[PDB]
Amino acid sequence: RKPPKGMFLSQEDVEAVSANATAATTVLRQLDMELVSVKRQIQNIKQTNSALKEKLDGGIEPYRLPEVIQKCNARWTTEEQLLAVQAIRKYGRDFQAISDVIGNKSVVQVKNFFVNYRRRFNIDEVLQEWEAE
């Protein structure tokens, strides 16, 4: 029903190696070249990636900023409200980004802000101008 296990003998392959006298040596060379072709292509990308790896040297270490650990407040200093309006102008509905900019407001308080000061800060106009970019 089947070959010995690990032996490869498909109807298709048998015909290919026996198609002529050296169709054997032909197909075995196509693969020998296909291997060498891929093998140098490996060292080519290995080379390219080595150079890219070195341009990433030092990582992003002299670029990280220490952590701002501040407790989440409920009241809106005019400061925070004004930070918000500008954040909306720059982020739209990215409540997470707006929350991170204001620093001490939860993602929901940000969403609350949207409905509370909706009329007074023309958030409709502010949002429609964020979309204009």
Contact between 41 and other proteins per CB under 8 A: yes
* Span from 13-21, 105-113, 114-122, 123-131 in contact with other proteins (CB under 8 A): 13-21
How many contiguous H segments (helices) and E segments (strands) does the chain have?
6, 0
Angle CA 99–104–105, to nearest 5: 50
Dist CA 87 CA 98 (whole Å):
5
103 touches other proteins (CB under 8 A): yes
Q: Which residue has the tokens 């060379």?
A: 29
Piece in contact with other proteins (CB under 8 A), picked from 59-67, 111-119, 122-130: 59-67
Kindly state whether residue 17 participates in binding other proteins, applying the rule CB under 8 A: yes
Measured between alpha carbons, how far is 68 from 85 in angstroms, rounded to an integer? 21
Among 27, 107, 126, 127, which residue sits at the site for other proteins (rule: CB under 8 A)? 27
- Rounded to whole angstroms, the Cα distance separating 34 from 42 reads 12
- Residue carrying the six token digits 């015909």: 15
Q: Does 90 bind other proteins (CB under 8 A)?
A: yes
List residues binding other proteins (CB under 8 A): 1-4, 6-9, 11, 13-14, 17-18, 24, 27-28, 31-32, 34-35, 38-39, 41-42, 45-46, 48-49, 52-53, 55-56, 59-60, 63-65, 68, 79, 82-83, 86-87, 90, 97, 100-103
